[PDB]
Amino acid sequence: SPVDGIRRRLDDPQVAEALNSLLDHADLLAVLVKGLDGFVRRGDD
């Protein structure tokens, strides 16, 4: 199945390691997108 095919990558070790590393520095991604949102809402300023 397509969705179960991605659910299989979820239990794939290397894929899991990379995703868990993305969840490690998730804060940084959140802050950069928040910074971009901020910059956008101050783009007129």
Next chain:
Amino acid sequence: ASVLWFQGGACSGNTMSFLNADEPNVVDLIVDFGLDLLWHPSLGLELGNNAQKVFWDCAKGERPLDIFVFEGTVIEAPNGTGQMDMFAGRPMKDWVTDLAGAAQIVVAIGDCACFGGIPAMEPNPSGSTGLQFHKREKGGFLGPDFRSKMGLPVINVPGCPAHPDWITQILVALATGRAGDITLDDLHRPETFFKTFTQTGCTRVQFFEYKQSTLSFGEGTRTGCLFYEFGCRGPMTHSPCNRILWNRQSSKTRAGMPCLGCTEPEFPHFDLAPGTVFKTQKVSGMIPKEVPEGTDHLTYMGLAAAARIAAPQWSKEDMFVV
């Protein structure tokens, strides 16, 4: 601790500022801190020969002189005679020589005494100079190598006038056994007051950071920093004017007046030449001739452009609102 306070080419502003002292106030300083004010031209009871007796006893060592405070310039004109400042039967400069040589500590209060100040502005008709400085140049009237009997150079409490705390807290420190806590900078100013800048504690530093200029006086000073259009010397001037507020209320910069850099030995800067009063001298109309202390025009200007582009909206609006 006996204190003899003399005035040379003074306007008595340092005395008046001193009289504004709070914590301690001047009366409590004179009475309750063991500082025996032998005489002061604005406050001493003695006149004429009784006053001169006090002065001569201090000068000749008949009575101890712990602190000689000198306010005003050492006037040397005409022709080095000092007769444009005759005090108690002598040129004031002769009194200065004797009493500075007699005192345990010599304190020059105010730019006039520290560095020559306003009277030393060209053409300097009075031949005014400071005790140990003429403007930035060390030596003044007493010479670069003058030391009081406690080994100190002239303690320069600059300002025009000095803030009362700049002298009173030094006097309290001397009176409370904390003389050893007093460190002096290269201009012999107490570092406890003169490591900071006027800008330190200025209510407009955020505008400075974001390069938002006050554009006009009056209500125009409800926003902005005075550095760019009014020649504020705050960032080039060592003082605690925004740390220890004047009259326990304010400071020039808070009020909207540019700091004139009066604690600096060059004061008045540029000798108040035309175009330099309440104006920022600029190169090519954009670059200040003088940048903040320790900065360079290229990094300053680069950071200034960056700060302008990233400026928040509030930095571009009135903040000292009614």
